[PDB]
């Protein structure tokens, strides 16, 4: 009440230092507060969402302001390939003369922006620093507006009722039509009015966007019916980005590949793409039922889906109420979808560079791919954790009888057993093949290793248009119906981009790719096994049938019944976090090595060294680590010294995580008791008395601290390694 | 340009703000 927690009298009454730790950890668990109600919970979440949107906008505004005030965007637009982007100025009192000179980029001490914001902003149409500054001001105003809205909605007069928060039909109809649809239509308008004209040497701004029309024919063709006039004259294929040489007037073309000069998707194709997407979204935004008496009811649709045979039981009868009354089920679904989308974003961005000149910037490409993939791993692991929380706290089997969800809980053992079998089969076989190749290669007999060609993946590549394998199926065969249908629309450009052999569109795959893809499979299956097992066994198990009665996160049940360490579902999530880091580490390792071999023009190294793990450790971790660990040495220092120091710092934080991950509470409790005795038994220091009794980190607190240390070290170590390697190798 | 703004803000946000925030936070948690 009057102590630090303020939301849990149980923690406020704790006389040890554990109260502050637990209060900080349980600060966002609104559902677990003492005086909490559904209406208050939803209102607090609404305000939190407003305050979070404001934080996101403030961050982006800060990036824009730093790039415009301290960056070199104006000097980078002229020669995007000769120069390098600048993130922000470096003002460190500890920098020595050598450090200052090493980090000097020509006029000031700054960092080389590796986030790829320069290419993005240059592609959308930004060409002046003043434009970036204005954008930052606008985003700051937007953040202030969202802050004001958040404070306004938490007031008693503007508090949204619970019924309004559960109006799924309207929320979906307004998010698919306006948040997703109108937003995409507006982006298309911007591209047609600013991005395309800016790319064609015609800078159009607020002062003249109402004066100059995007298309010479105006809007007359749109109202008449013949929209082809908007795709009549595309770029001449030799146009120079940012100039008017060989420019066209087509605003909505459907070319196939990337712009040859920028090796990025055509802006006209992007505008046409967003236009189609916006139309589809606005159309799909009218599906649900609102106050107009037209549409669908989510509950009716869910209840109408029930196989007559009864294989799925009572179908989705009751699923609607279960999802609507449970925020954790909603959060689990949203996190799962957002994770799949953020991983799809990385996979689609590397293969089809959307931003101009992004392909050349290898450092930014690798950093962004790894960035989104690691965030995707965290997002899917969080989705599974929230699903487990939903089973323990927001799931009542009484109301879910013979439901698809209830049936999932009924045969959970079969699901876990099959997932375990798949994970075991993949591990045994993938590691067996990797070590077999390693052993044979070690004995000087590389020809004896088992190299399985990825025939199925190569076939999908051929069906897409690849001709290296000579399958001649579908788009690879010019006589195919699909190829003939699109031969005059997008097939020529797309086939030129897929068969380039230099870009990352449908990269050539070999046995090494087959083996590592199987390893990727092993990791995905084992992580989902741990997470699915945690979610399904979250309510109970033969060892602890009353697990649901102890919540989602609890230390254990004591050494009784043989031992119950890590019995809680939270521990399943904590065990799956390590596997997610491993799986995503393998995925990023493979992407970075494949792309490093392609960029350097030596793919044979990967083709012949990825079959065995010795190569993965020598030609990738050891060979590429030379420029990273040489940032600073007795001879002097480099600009990569920061990356080397960060690499070592990450190694240290990772080991520190090992500390809490190995030693458990009990050794530290006694140690702290000994320290307490020492402090209260020494003169001149007895006056100082601890207000909170010192205590060792809790069992669960130790697992979370160790997992955070391990995670921070893993991410920071690979970030430093990838950035430093891709920099020194090509810089 | 305002080359003096970074020299006046970095020390404030790195030394003034953390110490002041920690002091206020310590008083709040203890009291």
């Amino acid at each position: 009440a009057t102590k630090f927690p303020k939301f849990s009298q149980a923690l406020a009454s704790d006389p040890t230092t554990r109260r502050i730790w637990y209060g900080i950890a349980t600060a966002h668990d609104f559902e677990s507060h003492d005086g909490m109600t559904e209406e208050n919970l939803y209102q607090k979440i609404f305000a939190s969402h407003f305050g979070h949107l404001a934080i996101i906008f403030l961050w982006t505004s800060g990036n824009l302001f730093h790039v415009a005030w301290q960056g070199n965007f104006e000097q980078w637009v002229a020669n995007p390939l000769k120069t390098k982007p600048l993130a922000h100025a470096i003002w460190d009192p500890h920098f020595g003369q050598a450090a200052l000179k090493a980090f000097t980029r020509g006029d000031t001490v700054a960092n080389i922006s590796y986030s790829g914001v320069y290419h993005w902003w240059y592609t959308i149409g930004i060409r002046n620093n003043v434009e970036l500054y204005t954008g930052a001001l606008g985003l700051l105003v937007l953040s202030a507006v969202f802050l004001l809205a958040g404070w306004l909605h938490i007031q008693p007069k503007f508090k949204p009722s619970l019924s309004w928060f559960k109006n799924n039909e309207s929320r979906l109809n307004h998010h698919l039509a306006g948040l997703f649809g109108v937003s995409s239509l507006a982006w298309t308008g911007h591209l047609v009015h600013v991005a395309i004209p800016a790319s064609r040497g015609q800078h159009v701004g607020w002062d003249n966007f109402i004066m100059t029309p995007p298309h010479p024919a105006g809007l007359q063709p749109f109202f008449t019916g013949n929209w082809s006039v908007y795709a009549q004259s595309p770029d001449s294929m030799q146009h120079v980005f940012g100039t008017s040489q060989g420019a066209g007037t087509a605003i909505l073309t459907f070319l196939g590949g990337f712009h040859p000069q920028t090796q990025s998707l055509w802006l006209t194709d992007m505008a046409h793409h967003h236009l189609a997407i916006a139309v589809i979204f606005i159309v799909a935004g009218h599906m649900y039922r609102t106050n107009f008496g037209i549409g669908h009811n989510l509950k009716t649709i869910l209840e109408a889906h029930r196989p007559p045979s009864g294989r799925l039981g009572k179908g989705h009868i009751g699923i609607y109420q279960t999802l609507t009354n449970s925020l954790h089920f909603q959060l689990g679904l949203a996190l799962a979808s957002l994770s799949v989308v953020t991983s799809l974003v990385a996979q689609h961005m590397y293969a089809m560079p959307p931003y101009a000149y992004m392909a050349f910037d290898y450092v930014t490409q690798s950093a962004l791919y790894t960035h989104h993939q690691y965030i995707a791993g965290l997002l899917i692991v969080g989705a599974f954790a929230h699903g487990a929380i939903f089973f323990i706290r927001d799931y009542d089997p009484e109301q879910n009888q013979d439901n698809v969800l209830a049936r999932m809980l009924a045969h959970k053992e079969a699901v876990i057993s099959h997932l375990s079998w798949v994970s075991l089969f993949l591990g045994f076989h993938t590691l067996g093949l990797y070590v077999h190749n390693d052993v044979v290669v070690a004995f000087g007999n590389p020809e004896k290793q088992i190299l399985i060609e990825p025939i199925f993946a190569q076939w999908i590549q051929a069906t897409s248009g690849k001709m290296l394998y000579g399958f001649q199926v579908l788009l690879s065969s010019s006589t195919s119906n699909a190829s003939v249908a699109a031969q005059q629309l997008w097939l020529p450009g797309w086939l030129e981009a897929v068969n380039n052999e230099s870009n990352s569109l449908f990269l050539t795959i070999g046995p090494g790719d087959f083996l590592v893809h199987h390893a990727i499979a092993l990791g995905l299956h084992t992580t989902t096994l741990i997470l699915v097992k945690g979610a399904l066994d979250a309510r109970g198990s033969k060892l602890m049938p009353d697990k649901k009665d102890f919540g989602y996160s609890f230390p254990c049940d004591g050494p009784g019944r043989g031992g119950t360490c890590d019995i809680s579902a939270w521990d399943a999530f904590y065990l799956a976090m390590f596997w997610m880091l491993n799986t995503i580490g393998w995925v990023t390792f493979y992407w970075h090595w494949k792309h490093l071999s392609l960029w350097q023009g030596n793919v044979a190294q990967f083709n012949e060294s990825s079959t065995y793990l010795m190569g993965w450790l020598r030609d990738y971790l050891w060979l590429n680590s030379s420029p990273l660990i040489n940032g600073y040495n007795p001879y002097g220092m480099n600009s990569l010294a920061v990356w080397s120091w960060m690499f070592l710092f990450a190694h240290l934080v990772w080991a520190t995580g090992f500390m809490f991950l190995i030693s458990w509470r009990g050794y530290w409790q006694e140690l702290i008791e000994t320290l307490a005795w020492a402090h209260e038994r020494t003169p001149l220091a007895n006056l100082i008395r601890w207000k909170d009794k010192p205590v060792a980190l809790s069992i669960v607190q130790a697992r979370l601290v160790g997992l955070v240390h391990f995670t921070v070290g893993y991410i920071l170590t690979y970030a430093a390694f990838v950035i430093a390697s891709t920099a020194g190798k090509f810089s | 340009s305002a080359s003096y703004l970074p020299s006046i803000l970095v020390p404030t946000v790195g030394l003034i703000l953390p110490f002041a925030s920690m002091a206020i936070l310590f008083i709040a948690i203890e009291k």
Binding site: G51, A54, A136, L137, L140, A144, L147, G150, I154 | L5
Partner: peptide, 27 residues
Amino acid sequence: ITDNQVFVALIMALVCGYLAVKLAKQL
């Protein structure tokens, strides 16, 4: 970006901070 422009941005940031301090204290 002129010095005056940076100062204007700082003033707006201060306003945003005040709003975000009010929003948090209300919560």
